[PDB]
Design a protein around this ligand. Structure first.
Ligand code: HEM
Ligand code: HEM
Ligand code: S42
Ligand code: S42
Ligand code: H4B
Ligand code: H4B
Ligand code: ZN
Lengths: 411, 407
């Protein structure tokens, strides 16, 4: 069956056949849409089917479907599974897998870049120290002195689920948050709980507004260990405004490298529970969400206070007006320091071309509208007007519970 | 089956049970979410009637009473005998109120129960329709202090006798393609405006011409009526700080009045049921003025503001978008015409969700539509998980009548 999406701005109509390769569930039924819901050990039993699907895909992509190399590999994986109960990906399959998990990430607006991804194979890693070294190298390579490069580091796969590699941090680089006796938070309220675990695990907290958190690393199902990223490796950008000279005096900065470290990568039924990946920021992630969410740095008040806006009635749109300035400032700052960043007009335009290209070459592009539309100025971006179909393809990135909820302490 | 919705800003979790009364289907499956697609006989009628009368008699705390059974009996007998039935005024009013209560795309539902229902089921001619619509327009405008209203024309009979308002809204601006290649006035209405000209309308060929009504009574061919100009309240758009803004020559109408939808109550279909409330500011300032396919005024405004339009990253679009929206709100408040900003509206809707969750077990809500088209994440609805499902009575989209009419 064919499925058509419409763009209401351009009248362009696309036909999706790729959704037919969807297996995983959406959360929705014919009676309920869960489109705005945030979160909606395998046996050889289910494993070989998942292995076979993946290797068929992989072999198709390299124009070798049905080849002797294809059949041989199938046969080899088959036996490894029934013999060892799992299997090892070849390098080329790991790289292709990781590229495709990104490609299939329907909440990611940056996917025009999916084929340019540096994969680091950290499957020989055995210890937390080993994980720390791998992660440092990723940070350094990805940062590239401001000329950011997409990268992922892939640590050993789940085996019995009792020996998982995990990065406890949700991102490689984030700022500490400290809940105060008076109820106020210092630093980033999103990280209070993780900051507290770090402190518990022995970290001496500077207790400032922008303290880079230490890494908390679990290898082989062992208790996690703390490591501070060399400060010289953590690129940061002071935020100033092109026209407002007082903007610098708000004392704002942000780090350059958005690097997600809490997600699970699935390739051919194998589960990679520690697979940190990084790209570059879209300006709004920082300027809109990190700075302006009420549950985050919540700076709207101070900025509008400094801009002398009419703050008595919301209908003055003082919030909206301060929000644009904060975002101009983020983009200005990153650009001035030559740190890669994309604005939300440019990111969304690119995504639309990528998406159309995906329909032409691939028969679809799964896309989550709730996430793809930027959290400011929604309708003046082309994605607002774009009908999207959301469905789940593997390989994929999945959410996992935070490891402190599941971890069995060895002590 | 018992479902939770979380707000990520506040950690408030609500439990939805109302969805388990979900009647119609979504477009979504276990395999594919269609959350962002805009458009996803005697036998059938009696369960539809019963289900509705059950909810009605439940609402007036009389479920299982003799008056309940007696009406269920009467409607039964009426359907078997006549192949349809008529709602009592009370049932009609309850039904209209609930179609609004159930409109998952409507952010303004905190108001759902203050709705003026005008029963136009006695209407027989397009002139009658015009009279009814003028009175609606006048009552709702109320010299700028807008009041919610719906006017309900006769229900579908055999489908060859539909009442329809051909306009999508009671009040809209004409659109004309120019030899110049561009578009004059509102490009959204170009096709309708041609049909008006072709049915006789004499267009002033101006940028803000109020379209004529095109009214279809009893499945007959539609007729043209101009709404009395003195009933169409309009607002010139000025900025509280940019003196030059007025020179753009922008105005908008005060009355948002949807006239193209289908009201379904207890299985009955009211195909002409224009309804109206009041505007949320972003509807005009963000969508009507700034959509590339609409009045598309961003560039001209940005230029007057002398912003750096050289690169997208200066956020000149965003900067000008904000001003355009300050101006809409400012003008409406200055001319004392009801308008709500998106901060206030979405805040009201969060309070409404809360009431609906405790009082009713949920609230069908479509996030894609509820989150304003500007500054999404700084309004509380952005952070609010919502479940979308279809409850009856309902407003349903229906195809533009010109694609369906036998002339
Ligand atoms: C190239 C630079 C990139 C840009 C500008 C970009 C943009 C974004 C943005 C704006 C989001 C939404 C983030 C949020 O609001 O939380 C996102 C989500 C996502 N991105 Fe991309 N991205 C980029 C690179 C990548 C890379 C390299 C991967 C993996 C290889 C990736 C996979 C994802 C996934 C899995 C999510 C959803 C994560 C979640 O649900 O928490 N992105 N990206
Ligand atoms: C009180 C003033 C009102 C406000 C501020 C309000 C707010 C809104 C907004 C912002 C939308 C989205 C419309 C769009 O973006 O095109 C909407 C859609 C809708 N509203 Fe309300 N509304 C109000 C009154 C009403 C009334 C009185 C009814 C029914 C009697 C109603 C039923 C609907 C329906 C059915 C839709 C979806 C229309 C469609 O799908 O095209 N609204 N409303
Ligand atoms: C590679 C990459 C590039 C880029 N431009 N941005 C990012 C930021 C990703 C990010 C940062 C913070 C928080 C989040 C996500 C939410 N924005 C974290 C999250 C939370 C929940 C509840 C579910 C879920 N699936 N995900 C994503 C990553
Ligand atoms: C009563 C009322 C109050 C208010 N504040 N705004 C409105 C605006 C309603 C409106 C105006 C213009 C256009 C539209 C809708 C689009 N925003 C028209 C439409 C188009 C399609 C394809 C599907 C669909 N379900 N609807 C709705 C109505
Ligand atoms: C409840 C709702 O799904 C939630 O707030 C989502 C909305 N859209 C989003 N979009 C992006 N890119 N990132 C987010 O964190 C969210 N949050
Ligand atoms: C494709 C997408 O569904 C479409 O652009 C929607 C998005 N959200 C919307 N939200 C509202 N309130 N009104 C609209 O017309 C739309 N358009
Ligand atoms: Zn859905």
């Amino acid at each position: 069956r064919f499925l058509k999406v419409k763009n209401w701005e351009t009248d362009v109509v696309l036909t999706d056949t790729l959704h037919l390769k969807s297996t995983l569930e959406t959360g929705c039924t014919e009676h309920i849409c869960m489109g705005s819901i945030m979160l909606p050990v395998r046996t050889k039993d289910q494993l070989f089917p998942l292995a076979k699907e993946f290797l068929d895909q992989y072999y198709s992509s390299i124009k070798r479907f049905g080849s002797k190399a294809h059949m041989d590999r199938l046969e080899e994986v088959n036996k490894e599974i029934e013999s060892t109960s799992t299997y090892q990906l070849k390098d080329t399959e790991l790289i292709y897998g990781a590229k495709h998990a990104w490609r299939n990430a329907s909440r990611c607006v940056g996917r025009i870049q999916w084929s340019k991804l540096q994969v680091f194979d950290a499957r020989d890693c055995t210890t937390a120290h080993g994980m720390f070294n791998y992660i440092c190298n990723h940070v350094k390579y990805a940062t590239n002195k401001g000329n950011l490069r997409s990268a992922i580091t892939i640590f050993p796969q789940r085996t019995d689920g009792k020996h998982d590699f995990r990065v406890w941090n949700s991102q490689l680089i984030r700022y500490a948050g400290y809940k105060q006796p008076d109820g106020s938070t210092l630093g980033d309220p999103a990280n209070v709980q993780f900051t507290e675990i770090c402190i518990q695990q022995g970290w001496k907290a500077p207790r400032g507004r922008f303290d880079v958190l230490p890494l908390l690393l679990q290898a082989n199902g062992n208790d996690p260990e703390l490591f501070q990223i060399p400060p010289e490796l953590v690129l940061e950008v002071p935020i100033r405004h092109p026209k407002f000279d007082w903007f610098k005096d708000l004392g704002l900065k942000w780090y350059g490298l958005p690097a997600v470290s809490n997600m699970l990568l699935e390739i051919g039924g194998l589960e990679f529970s520690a697979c940190p990946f990084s790209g570059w920021y879209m300006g709004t992630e920082i300027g809109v969400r990190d700075y302006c969410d009420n549950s985050r740095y919540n700076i709207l008040e101070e900025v509008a206070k400094k801009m002398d806006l009419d703050m008595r009635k919301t209908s003055s749109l003082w919030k909206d007006q301060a929000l644009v300035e904060i975002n101009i400032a983020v983009l200005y700052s990153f650009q001035s320091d030559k740190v890669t960043i994309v604005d939300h007009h440019s990111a969304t335009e690119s995504f639309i071309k990528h998406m159309e290209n995906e329909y032409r070459c691939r028969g679809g592009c799964p896309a989550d509208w709730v996430w793809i539309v930027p959290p400011m100025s929604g309708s003046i971006t082309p994605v607002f007007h774009q009908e999207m179909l959301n469905y789940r393809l593997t390989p994929s990135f999945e959410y996992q519970p935070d490891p402190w909820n599941t971890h069995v302490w060895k002590g």
